Design a protein around this nucleic acid. Sequence first.
DNA 1: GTCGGCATAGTGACTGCATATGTTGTGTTTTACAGTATTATGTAGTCTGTTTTTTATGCAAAATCTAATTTAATATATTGATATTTATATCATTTTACG
DNA 2: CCGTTTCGCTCAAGTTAGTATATTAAAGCTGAACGAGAAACGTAAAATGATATAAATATCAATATATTAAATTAGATTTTGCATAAAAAACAGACTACATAATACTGTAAAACACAACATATGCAGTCACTATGCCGAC
DNA 3: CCGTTGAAGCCTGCTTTTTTATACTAACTTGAGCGAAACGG
Length: 89
Amino acid sequence: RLTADEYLKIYQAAESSPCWLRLAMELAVVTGQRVGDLCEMKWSDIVDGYLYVEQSKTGVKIAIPTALHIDALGISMKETLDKCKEILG
DNA sequence: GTCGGCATAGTGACTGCATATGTTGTGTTTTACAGTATTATGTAGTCTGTTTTTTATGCAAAATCTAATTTAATATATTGATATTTATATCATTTTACG
DNA sequence: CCGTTTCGCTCAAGTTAGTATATTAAAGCTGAACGAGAAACGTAAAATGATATAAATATCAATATATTAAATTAGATTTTGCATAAAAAACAGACTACATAATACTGTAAAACACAACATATGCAGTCACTATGCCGAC
DNA sequence: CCGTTGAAGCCTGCTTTTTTATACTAACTTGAGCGAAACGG
């Protein structure tokens, strides 16, 4: 499994890596979604502070609000999403 | 357990009974295509009304393009001490140029 | 310092205490082979730095005056975005006419095999030899 | 203060009512043979 200390050591080591990996890390931990759907997420899915996600594996339908925030690593759902709209685009 | 002499021990040659195999002949049963006829087939030869596509203008919308026009910018014209570029061309260093 | 006996340990065979899963369904991870465009490199060629000196040409202030490129309009017009609608051609919606397969039915040769009396090679039936050490007997 | 009658009792065939299932998994517990530590000479 993965711990909190380990994740911090990997995120910093992802410096040599592109600018989308770090965003993919924080996003995959703030949403807790599977890698399969994280790639099929469009900015059109976000509706009025929500995040409509259609799981491909099971097929469950949920909506993660853009107000979440991990209090252990220092990551915010909102600050993470907007960081992807500025860098990536 | 080997070596020496009639008895072992399957396989091969030999001879005629016994029977499946090779022919010949009569006769039933059913396959297999030719030839004319019947009629629903698929395309053929056109007519007609609805759907589709080429076609001949029509016009509000859009802003450049040309000529009238004014003015900052450019040129003439002084005058003279001081600073910069200038003719040639073999060496030396930077930048262009194709693979 | 040394020996002897008890005690801490682990191996070996009985005596008890506890908890309970298999398939679907759909992914997710990661070693390994596969397929172009742009810029840093590099040798070679072209433009430029090197270099200096008397003579030639440009450096520039301070203001009058004729000249002119060109943005600034300001009105003129091709150019451009967008349908509207009918002439003209395409093409289902009908239908008889025409040549063509599946089928309806008669006409005829012949394939395919039982049935039956013979004919006879050949496999099977019955007995002895081929080919060479056993068994039994001596060494 | 003897003799008959009736509440009980076992044999058989039912008719129910409480306990324990099947199996790997993981230990626990009393010998006995064995090596090292610690006390007695």
